[PDB]
């Protein structure tokens, strides 16, 4: 059986602010600009539709120097940093971006018609854009976060795949990763493994994997290390209705209708997709620069960041605006030409994290050790390299960041206020 | 470039089994249709198939006459003929719908023809 | 005279908690694919439009393994489960869907026009895509639920029904399959028995029949067991003012206009149609993943499961995203080809029922045979085959499921929190 840290976990008087200086990222809002010979990133992409994965390295508070060590015994037992407030600072003005595609597959405008439609020929994409829908969410955790996205399942081994047949589905959990996209509105799938076509959506997620967090499955976790907080706001409306073109992978069932003639004769395609939109961003509808209080979880683990990390998942697009920014080539004529300027976009991002941490103790009695050995064995193991190497995040660390007087700062301020004592 | 079979000679009764093969384009995404000619006389519909799932449509004429199939690993249509008469002797032709899985816009491409003697 | 179930039910001490790992569901947005030849279903119909009704299986708590059974006495009484709490998790990400139809009958536009429309022809169908009214609803009872729609009435024996005549209608209840579709913004009617035309709603609705849930009947129901409980948040708006090709089939009296002359001489249909909108989708208003605590029923049955049964209807349209797939015929040329990639469409549901359910006796006593025998006569037969085997559900067993640690559980630490002890 599990038990809240409530049990084990004794909760010391001692609290410390921690803090980032203030992240900055800047990049191009669609792909990574590159050297065409080469391979090495000249400029990242940095989109506000890309999910920001905080990996916070906390100082071991075992190896810390506290000014008074009378607080416990270190041979009975052990420290841990419990995490009691967060404020994830953003900075950049309010704003919505917007992404597209040069060749998106767009057949018709089948949101109203006065007449059939043509023919489709060779190649009959346009260069269109949107404005993606809009989401923030916040995920905490002492454990990096999960996702769920549909990709390409193994096939069955019968019916040998005839080329162009339709590809398996499979919901995949993941972990969400530093960079990783977010649902833009089409929802939460691997469109490279899933659209040969390459032009259904814009360029951005065009041969990416957008993905959702699996958020059942995180809070039906055992422990609940994944996640012990979270806040989510998504919306989006219906802007443009479409048609796709290709060729009929299914047949509409011709139970379902009348057959025409003439121009009506053959079926135009019945492939529909909406354009997404995500609505006015605005101030009152903020979740961030807001302080959050983790006192009760609704998982067993409240806020201890077991190993001394710290995970803080964010995703923004209320401030997604991209900004276009021209070089001319010549500074000479006095006549506008399309060919003396060359266009850019770039887009920035602007973070500022703030925690407000409690010293907690463990006294290592042999029911504490044989549990928390269970739960995970590296805790003890580490008490008295990186095992997840292979993925990626945004590393923050506040090692020497940790600071006594929450008077100093803001976040503690509103922490000492809000708690009274 | 379609190929059809060779002369076939059947005694009334009978059955035969004609191929048509294709070849220079993508089979997996046309139908097939075949028609019927008798002696110094006109052209006559018999049916079409969809090779995929072997869906096809029948002239009412050739309904238990005719049954359409197709081997899409090798690109190749069937038509198979039952209870064979006199009046069944004639040149078979199998031709390409032009737009892919429609049947409009005529029939660009013809096979060679394949002639069934019924005596 | 019916009596609160409080009457006769005795609560216990005992609460289980119970669970479905995760309900998945994947298939064609529109219309189910199968072997034209044949009749199996290769791939299924799955939209966020239609109706999940769940058919939930217990284990008999008078068979069940307690570990403890002084609680009672199995000569004077009988256990029953009593439904508390519910969680209807669901987890894809939000987002809104799209139906239409290749040859929809939609003559003229007619929210604005500079110039009377030309004439009506043959064929003057669109290929048009809308997106459907919201709606989000959650249906509970131990009975399943009930739905009403317009229908085909019968005729009245006397004029002979000239052929085109307009049918009579007539308001038809029926149980609530799972699989059914909801009102999408043509109202609930059965468009296969009330449209020869085959063509006035989009594909997805077009032969089927829309349902909306009978609440009036269902809470006049003398005994409540059809639903105890429920949710319903639905909205609509007009995207677009349309026109009906096809011919009058009742005019328009001429007290109710000047005839007109030239062009407006004759009458353009005034048989108006919109289409329908739900507009924006949004966290805020989610209806689902919060926990409903079924304590004080408004009918006589407060969530007893008669039958070890129990009912929980569905209808999301917040997530409704479908996703269209395209797989390359060839992996050659490196020129877009419209014939070379054939295009798809699917869609996938995530759901996930969670239950806290509480023990309880009924001492059998000649009044309450009387009662319950009078109520629902199986009862008590079954106590020391299906009798909806005509009606399809999702089938859910939970017999393996029930576990007597709610603290295990994220609705059962939920349900401990909430009610204290």
């Known amino acids: 059986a599990v038990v809240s840290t409530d049990e084990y976990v004794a909760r010391t008087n001692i609290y410390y602010h921690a803090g980032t200086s203030r992240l900055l990222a800047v990049g191009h809002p669609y792909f990574p600009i590159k050297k065409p010979n080469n391979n090495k990133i000249l400029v990242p992409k940095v989109s506000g539709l890309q999910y920001r994965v905080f990996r916070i390295h906390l100082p071991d508070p075992n190896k810390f120097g506290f000014p008074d060590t009378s607080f416990y015994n270190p041979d009975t037992q052990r420290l841990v940093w419990a995490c009691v407030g967060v404020e994830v600072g953003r900075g950049q003005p309010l704003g919505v971006g917007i992404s597209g595609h040069p060749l998106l597959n767009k057949l018709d405008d089948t949101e109203n018609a006065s007449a059939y439609a043509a023919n489709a020929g060779v190649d009959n994409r346009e260069c269109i854009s949107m404005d993606y829908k809009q989401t923030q969410l916040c995920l905490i955790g002492c454990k990096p976060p999960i996702g769920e996205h549909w990709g390409k399942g193994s096939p069955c081994t019968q019916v040998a795949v005839q080329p162009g047949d339709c590809p398996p589905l499979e919901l995949i959990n993941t972990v969400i990763q530093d960079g990783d996209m977010v649902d833009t509105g089409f929802g939460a799938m691997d469109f490279t493994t899933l659209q040969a076509n390459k032009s259904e959506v814009p360029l951005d997620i065009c041969t990416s994997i957008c993905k959702y967090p699996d958020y059942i499955k995180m809070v039906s976790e055992p422990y609940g290390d994944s996640l012990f907080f979270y806040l989510r706001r998504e919306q989006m409306f219906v802007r443009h209705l479409f048609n796709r073109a290709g060729t009929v992978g299914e047949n509409v069932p011709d139970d379902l209708y009348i057959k025409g003639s003439g121009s009506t004769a053959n079926l135009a395609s019945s492939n529909y997709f909406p354009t997404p939109s995500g609505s006015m961003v605005t101030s009152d509808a903020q979740i961030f620069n807001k302080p959050y209080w983790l006192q009760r979880a609704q998982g067993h683990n409240n806020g201890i960041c077991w190993g001394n990390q710290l995970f803080v998942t964010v995703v923004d697009t209320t401030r997604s605006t991209n900004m276009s920014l021209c070089a001319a080539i010549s500074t000479s004529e006095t006549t506008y030409k399309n060919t003396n300027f060359k266009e850019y976009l770039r887009h920035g991002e602007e973070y500022d994290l703030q925690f407000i941490f409690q010293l907690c103790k463990i006294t290592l009695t042999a029911d504490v050790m044989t549990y928390i050995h269970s739960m995970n064995s590296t805790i003890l193991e580490d008490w008295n390299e990186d095992p997840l190497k292979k993925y990626t995040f945004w590393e923050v660390n506040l090692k020497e960041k940790f600071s006594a007087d929450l008077d100093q700062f803001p976040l503690g301020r509103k922490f000492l206020l809000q708690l009274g004592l | 470039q379609l190929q059809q079979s060779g002369a076939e000679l059947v005694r009334p009764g009978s059955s035969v089994k004609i191929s048509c093969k294709a070849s220079?384009?993508?089979?997996?995404?046309?139908?097939m249709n075949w028609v019927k000619q008798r002696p110094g006389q006109g052209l006559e519909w018999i049916g079409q198939?969809?090779?995929?799932?072997?869906?096809?449509n029948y002239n009412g004429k050739f309904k238990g006459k005719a049954t359409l199939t197709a081997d899409k690993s090798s690109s190749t249509a069937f038509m198979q003929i039952s209870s064979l008469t006199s009046e069944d002797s004639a040149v078979y032709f199998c031709?390409?719908?032009?737009?892919?899985?429609?049947?409009?816009?005529?029939?660009?491409?013809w096979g060679q023809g394949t002639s069934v003697t019924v005596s | 005279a019916v009596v609160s179930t409080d009457e006769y039910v005795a609560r216990t001490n005992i609460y289980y908690h119970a669970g479905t790992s995760r309900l998945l569901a994947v298939g064609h947005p529109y219309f189910p694919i199968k072997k034209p030849n044949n009749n199996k279903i290769l791939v299924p119909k799955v939209s966020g439009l239609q109706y999940r009704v769940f058919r939930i299986h217990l284990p008999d708590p008078n068979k069940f393994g307690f570990p403890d059974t002084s609680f009672y006495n199995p000569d004077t009484q009988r256990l029953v489960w009593a439904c508390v709490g519910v969680e209807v998790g669901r987890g894809q990400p939000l987002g809104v869907g799209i139906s239409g139809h290749p040859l929809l009958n939609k003559l003229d536009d007619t929210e604005n026009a500079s110039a009377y429309a030309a004439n009506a022809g043959v064929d003057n169908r669109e290929c048009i895509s809308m997106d459907y009214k919201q709606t989000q609803l959650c249906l509970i009872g131990c009975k399943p639920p009930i739905g009403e729609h317009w229908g085909k009435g019968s005729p009245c024996t006397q004029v002979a029904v000239q052929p085109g005549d307009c049918p009579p209608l007539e308001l038809i209840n029926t149980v609530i399959q799972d699989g059914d579709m909801v009102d999408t913004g043509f109202g609930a009617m059965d468009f296969t028995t009330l449209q020869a035309n085959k063509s006035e709603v989009p594909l997805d609705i077009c032969t089927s029949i829309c349902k909306y849930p009978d609440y009036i009947k269902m809470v006049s129901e003398p005994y409540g067991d059809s639903l105890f409980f429920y949710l319903r948040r639905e909205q609509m708006f007009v995207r677009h003012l349309f026109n009906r090709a096809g011919t009058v089939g009742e005019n328009v009296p001429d007290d109710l206009y000047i005839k007109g002359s030239g062009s407006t001489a004759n009458l353009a249909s005034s048989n108006y149609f919109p289409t329908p909108s739900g507009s924006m989708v949004t966290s805020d208003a989610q209806i689902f993943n919060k926990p409903y605590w079924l304590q004080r029923a408004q009918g006589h049955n407060n969530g007893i499961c008669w039958g070890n049964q129990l009912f929980v209807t569905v209808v999301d349209t917040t997530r409704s995203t479908n996703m269209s797939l395209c797989a390359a015929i060839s992996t050659s040329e490196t020129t877009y080809k419209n014939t070379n990639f054939k295009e798809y469409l699917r869609h996938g549901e995530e759901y996930d029922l969670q239950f806290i359910f509480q023990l309880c006796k009924i001492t059998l006593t000649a009044d309450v045979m009387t009662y319950i025998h009078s109520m629902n006569s199986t009862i008590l037969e079954d106590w020391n085959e299906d009798p909806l085997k005509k009606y399809t559900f999702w089938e859910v067993n939970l017999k393996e499921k029930f576990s007597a640690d709610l603290d295990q559980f994220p609705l059962g630490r939920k349900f401990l929190l909430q009610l204290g002890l």
């Open positions: 220079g384009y993508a089979f997996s995404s046309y139908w």
């Open positions: 198939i969809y090779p995929g799932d072997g869906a096809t």
């Open positions: 031709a390409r719908p032009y737009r892919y899985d429609g049947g409009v816009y005529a029939m660009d491409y």
